[PDB]
Amino acid sequence: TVKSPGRVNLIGEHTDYTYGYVMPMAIDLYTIITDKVQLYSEHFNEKLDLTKEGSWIDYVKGVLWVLIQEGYKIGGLKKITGDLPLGAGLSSSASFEVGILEVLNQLYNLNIDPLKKALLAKKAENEFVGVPCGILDQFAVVFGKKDNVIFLDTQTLQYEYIPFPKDVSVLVFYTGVKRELASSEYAERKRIAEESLRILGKESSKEVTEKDLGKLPPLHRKFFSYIVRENARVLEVRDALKEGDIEKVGKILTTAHWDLAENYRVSCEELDFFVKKAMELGAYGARLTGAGFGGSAIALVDKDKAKTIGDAILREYLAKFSWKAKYFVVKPSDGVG
Numbered sequence: 001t002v003k004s005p006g007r008v009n010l011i012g013e014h015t016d017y018t019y020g021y022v023m024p025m026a027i028d029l030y031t032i033i034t035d036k037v038q039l040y041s042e043h044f045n046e047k048l049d050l051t052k053e054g055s056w057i058d059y060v061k062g063v064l065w066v067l068i069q070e071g072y073k074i075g076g077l078k079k080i081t082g083d084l085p086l087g088a089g090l091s092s093s094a095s096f097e098v099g100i101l102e103v104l105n106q107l108y109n110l111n112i113d114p115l116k117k118a119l120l121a122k123k124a125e126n127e128f129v130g131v132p133c134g135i136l137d138q139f140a141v142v143f144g145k146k147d148n149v150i151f152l153d154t155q156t157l158q159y160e161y162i163p164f165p166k167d168v169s170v171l172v173f174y175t176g177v178k179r180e181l182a183s184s185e186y187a188e189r190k191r192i193a194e195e196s197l198r199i200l201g202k203e204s205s206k207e208v209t210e211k212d213l214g215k216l217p218p219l220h221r222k223f224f225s226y227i228v229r230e231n232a233r234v235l236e237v238r239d240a241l242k243e244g245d246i247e248k249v250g251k252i253l254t255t256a257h258w259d260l261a262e263n264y265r266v267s268c269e270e271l272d273f274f275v276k277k278a279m280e281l282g283a284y285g286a287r288l289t290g291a292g293f294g295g296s297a298i299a300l301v302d303k304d305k306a307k308t309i310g311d312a313i314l315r316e317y318l319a320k321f322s323w324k325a326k327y328f329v330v331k332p333s334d335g336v337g
Ligand SMILES: Nc1ncnc2c1ncn2[C@@H]1O[C@H](COP(=O)(O)OP(=O)(O)O)[C@@H](O)[C@H]1O
Pocket: 031, 041, 042, 043, 044, 055, 056, 057, 059, 080, 081, 082, 085, 086, 087, 088, 089, 090, 091, 092, 093, 094, 096
């Protein structure tokens, strides 16, 4: 049996597709996997000689395809339970991918080293399932460590563990919203960023200057100016956190949210409602997490106060919107084990 965590991004959003900085954490809500390929998906109540079908099994088929293309000698396997909500923005995708991968890693004794576990799970999701996405999710879910977040330079895969204060909790709030446009909006942001680097002669958003941004056209400059600003915030969250100044960390997430919401235009009414309400109830800061357009948000909150805050925002939110929102008081966790 294998426990694969989900994940949350502390700071550094829409940054990995230009090879900038990122600071995920694995969280303590999991996927749990228990001759041919025949699996029971407990959530769905349901299913080597490798076609896409249009169903969830496609994540399973993409990992075996990716191990085989790489030459590993594996076989089949014969149940999936879990805490983790699907489609919430807590990357059940990556949890499931690398949970499957590590079952094979353990059984068929592949002794695959961690960073390849992540790069392998991400190729399965990019090439097999049709879904674009940097290394954020797979890395977090594999490299998570107990009382830590992971600073990652995604250009160079150079990472650093930074203790997250034990008397501070990350409040995860799932809005219940998954907008249908989210997918093509992600790809547009991504298309536009790729183009910007290309116009500028640059290879990463770490390199980009004030005079560089002046050379981009209106929308490209609006979108890329945000990324250059996040990169800087990540570095500032990095120092703040290593001094245990969680109030500075919190102020920075807050700035980040409104830069995301106004400029990169990937927030929505209900993420903003959560952030606004978190701040009326004493949070250090709060901010959407993941792609945007719905999904989940985080608030930094004292541990002793977290359930009272969450319950307050939940009821406040459920009076305003009809979606099935949930929240979780979450602990930074170990990656796949
Ligand atoms: N426990 C699971 N059992 C079966 N399928 C799963 C499981 N976890 C994730 N999945 C599959 O992965 C998808 C997760 O979707 P995704 O678009 O990446 O949203 P999220 O960001 O939460 O991962 C689900 O739709 C489902 O097809």
